[PDB]
Ligand binder design. Structure first.
Ligand code: I7P
Ligand code: CL
Ligand code: CL
Ligand code: MG
Ligand code: MG
Ligand code: MG
Length: 134
């Protein structure tokens, strides 16, 4: 069930899934519709679901990782697609071999240096590139 803010923006949560507390390498996943493109894992908040809980759930489903939830980075809008995403830091401590989206849609995952994550997100996902600005 999709959920919405009072202005009709779809509510989403996502994590920047870092390898370590150094925050030098981040895990991106393939686009579901265009698997040659990379995205930051994330998705819709469920009814009454805390954003931090949604963020951790979506990372598990899409990227097959678990770890230590860190700070809220910020709340980011995509004006064209009308969605508003809470973005958290997650320090990955568990990498699972088989995960929901690998089994169901063959979703891929890959580690990127921050500068390279920004580069591959810029063309189709410039708001997700902007998650790393600070
Ligand atoms: O363009 P499309 O129809 O292929 O899908 C878009 C996006 O559509 P939009 O731009 O109209 O919002 C989906 O949102 P909706 O239309 O379902 O509300 C979104 O689901 P999401 O918010 O993450 O929600 P969850 O399913 O994770 O909860 C999905 O991400 P994937 O999860 O990776 O499939 C995106 O694909 P892409 O980013 O290319 O992978
Ligand atoms: Cl790191
Ligand atoms: Cl976006
Ligand atoms: Mg998603
Ligand atoms: Mg999802
Ligand atoms: Mg979802």
């Amino acid at each position: 069930t999709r959920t919405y803010d009072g202005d009709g923006y779809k509510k989403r949560a996502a994590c920047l899934c870092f390898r370590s507390e150094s925050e030098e390498e981040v895990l991106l996943v393939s686009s579901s519709r265009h698997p040659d493109r990379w995205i930051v894992p994330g998705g819709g908040m469920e009814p009454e679901e805390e954003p931090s809980v949604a963020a951790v759930r979506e990372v598990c489903e899409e990227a097959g990782v678990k770890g230590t939830l860190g700070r809220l980075v910020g709340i980011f809008e995509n004006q064209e697609r009308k969605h508003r995403t809470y973005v958290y830091v997650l320090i990955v401590t568990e990498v699972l071999e088989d995960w929901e989206d690998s089994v169901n849609i063959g979703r891929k995952r890959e580690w990127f240096k921050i500068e390279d994550a920004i580069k591959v997100l810029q063309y189709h996902k410039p708001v997700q590139a902007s998650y790393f600005e600070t």
